[PDB]
Design a protein around this ligand. Structure first.
Ligand code: 22B
Ligand code: BNG
Ligand code: BNG
Ligand code: BNG
Ligand code: BNG
Ligand code: BNG
Ligand code: BNG
Ligand code: RET
Ligand code: RET
Ligand code: RET
Lengths: 260, 261, 260
């Protein structure tokens, strides 16, 4: 029975792990302060909705990363027969424990933050309610089935079946970003900025399922420490710089996005 | 003590249980493909909202049933003194384990899918936001208190108290379906189709608390495998057939439901 | 180790704890009946939306208190080194068990009920969607980070860090309540009733983080039983009397909240 304290201490004493986590807690906090400063001039309710949705991204990130750092949202799971990480062991407390240190808490970071990123993008693109609803519901389904895949230890094949379902949901979100909102942004007069944020988002988001496949959750070419840093690097771009670019535009183009 | 693998293997090797779960994974998948194909011609935003809300039903179902088949959302619980399934055994891994294989994952299938069924129906009936909000919130309360009932092992009476709270929430949903939306559909011009789907929905949904009461969660006249098939059969009609019928109407009457979201 | 039945019995057989839980189950139930009766004459859809949102408060409360009374949402946690409740015992069943009985179920009562309180108040004040969204999202964040604080056992300081994050989110909600909705209510013609409900909400809500700090979750000057009654008393006011007052006004001013 691994304790929360043992996982908290495990993160510590492990350079790659501890740094990938605490650096994001710090960047998330600094991002929030910066973004609040940047948007104090906004008055339009719609511009402010986009701003708050955007600021909620680093808010969810600081809370969720603290969930990981504290050990609260970390568990030790034993992979099923055939899985590349099956047979692995980790030193926890004063004994060797079978399994993999599983940072399932990252899925909470994703399920709560990705909907805010999508809401901000859709509002920016002048999306109607149907498309926002579709993008957000399928995005949440993608995140939850991804968590289910990571939490499945009964069967190797089942883990990848979950992965396939999640990818299917991801395709829906990608279609809306690349095809529908890309067109809607033209009518909203935000075609240029949306194009930039869209490219950034699509490229970075595609990185997550790749890291999943290569990291300990997948074929394990990337160890627990590198897997964590891979995800943390993606978050810095998909969340913090994405948010800065969006807000930097918003604070200089409040008139453009003002509306009902 | 009991592992996910042991539960996964228990489901496999158990013909009734295995089939009740995997057949729905298959039917939900085929439903998604069929529904996406059927609705490819839709252009109106409101019509498309009704379409996506309906399609989300089998999407939630396939994911949720995978949760059950994989063993992820199944647990072994020991019923409280006096419960008709108290003292049951299950044989897992290789030994006899006290308790009942509890497929609590079904409550997730319900909590995430029923709001979508209701959203689709409310929109079809031309419901205002107040009634949709009321129907959906009490519907979620119904499924969550139902899950709590199944997860309660401390007291037999408590299990049924949760069941009673859930039933009361169910009454709110039934009232909205039978009284409010029944009338709203006439103004929306969808009276014939809504009344039909309203009736099909009410009849099938009534089956769930009956199965709960008769199954292993209740008086246990229905063993685990039979309780599972009862729910899976209800799901096939309340979800897949229901959705197929709604989409059939939708794709031939886009203009009728078109308008401001 | 500790079973649900053992926690269920711990609550029973303890006059203080049992009364603090079962009384609210009774009051919540009676409140639902009373409120439904009180609002049976409403016809306006906007007024009805405010009424349902309000009625959901005691609905969530009766379900959540049943979660606690049944033992379903209670756990036994061992506090970290430095915590004032470290090395505590309880006697679960008939044995001496290390740790403190943690009624984390209360956070569920809060995360699901507070958004409904805020939705009702925001609508009464004639708030736009942006402010409602901001108040509700940060309110949920406050509740979830508070839950995380209570569930954290890896570090004593980590618990207070979660507490700090939660307080920051609370300030956002307080700002909207005290500054923004105070103004909106004037234009909506509900300034007088809002002032009353606003005052009651702010004063009562401020009490929760105080009880947290003083109870077993914090410095532990208040035993498990007194911590429970403190929250239960706050709930009676922040929920039931608050709801009654709002509904009493609502039914007497249906036309004003309707708009036209
Ligand atoms: C939490 C619970 C039950 C939930 C709710 C109850 C009781 C009543 C809800 C009534 C409603 C929603 C009326 C809708 C109207 C609007 C209608 C519309 C807009 C749609 O047209 C309006 C104007 C809002 O009123 C369980 C038990 C709660 C309480 C008790 C005492 C249970 C006891 C059980 C046993 C077994 C003894
Ligand atoms: C395993 C779960 C995966 C299910 C994937 C099916 C989702 C179908 C969503 O509908 C489609 O959404 C597009 C973007 O909004 C519309 O352009 C298109 O017309 C509509 O048909
Ligand atoms: C429609 C959803 C698709 C998921 C299909 C999952 C079924 C895979 C079952 O695998 C088998 O399980 C046995 C018992 O655990 C092992 O002994 C055996 O070695 C393994 O190969
Ligand atoms: C609306 C549906 C009706 C549900 C009725 C539920 C009745 C079940 C009561 O349980 C029994 O209560 C006794 C006293 O508390 C216990 O001594 C006994 O062990 C326990 O099994
Ligand atoms: C809608 C379904 C109705 C549910 C009815 C549940 C009744 C359960 C009856 O069980 C019995 O209760 C006795 C106490 O009264 C116990 O002493 C006895 O051991 C127990 O077996
Ligand atoms: C408002 C609804 C609240 C439900 C309250 C349920 C109380 C039922 C208490 O039953 C008793 O519990 C003891 C401890 O487990 C058993 O030893 C005893 O045999 C059993 O009869
Ligand atoms: C630990 C997380 C705490 C971070 C809190 C910062 C969130 C910033 C929310 O934006 C602010 O909301 C106010 C009320 O709506 C507006 O009056 C103000 O103009 C706007 O800038
Ligand atoms: C702040 C975090 C962000 C933007 C996270 C994005 C995550 C994804 C796009 C994840 C996608 C996945 C799949 C498509 C397949 C299964 C595994 C996942 C969950 C990694
Ligand atoms: C796809 C699943 C559907 C349509 C499920 C519907 C479920 C219900 C109507 C459940 C109702 C219940 C009660 C009213 C009492 C307590 C037990 C439940 C949860 C089975
Ligand atoms: C019905 C319940 C109500 C109105 C609950 C309100 C709760 C709060 C305002 C809680 C606030 C907290 C903090 C600000 C800090 C950390 C701990 C909490 C969760 C108790």
């Amino acid at each position: 029975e691994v304790t929360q304290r043992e996982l908290f201490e495990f993160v510590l004493n492990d350079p790659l792990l501890a740094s990938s986590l605490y650096i994001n807690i710090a960047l998330a906090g600094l991002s929030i302060l910066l973004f609040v400063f940047m948007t104090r001039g906004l008055d339009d309710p719609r511009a402010k909705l986009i701003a708050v949705s955007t600021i909620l991204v680093p808010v969810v990130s600081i809370a969720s990363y603290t969930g990981l750092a504290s050990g609260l949202t970390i568990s030790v799971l034993e992979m099923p027969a055939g899985h590349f990480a099956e047979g692995s062991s980790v030193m926890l407390g004063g004994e060797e424990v079978d399994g993999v240190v599983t940072m399932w808490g990252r899925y909470l970071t994703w399920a709560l933050s990705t909907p805010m990123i999508l809401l901000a993008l859709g509002l920016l693109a002048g999306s109607n309610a149907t498309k926002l609803f579709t993008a957000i519901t399928f995005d949440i389904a993608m995140c939850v089935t991804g968590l289910a895949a990571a939490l499945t230890t009964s069967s190797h094949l089942m883990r990848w079946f979950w992965y396939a379902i999640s990818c299917a949901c991801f395709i829906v979100v990608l279609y809306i970003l690349l095809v529908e909102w890309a067109q809607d942004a033209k009518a909203a007069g935000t075609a240029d900025i949306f194009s930039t944020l869209k490219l950034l988002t699509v490229v970075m988001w595609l990185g997550y399922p790749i890291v999943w496949a290569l990291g300990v959750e997948g074929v394990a070419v990337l160890p627990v420490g590198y897997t964590s840093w891979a995800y943390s690097a993606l978050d810095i771009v998909a969340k913090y710089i994405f948010a800065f670019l969006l807000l930097n535009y918003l604070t200089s183009n409040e008139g453009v996005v003002s509306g009902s």
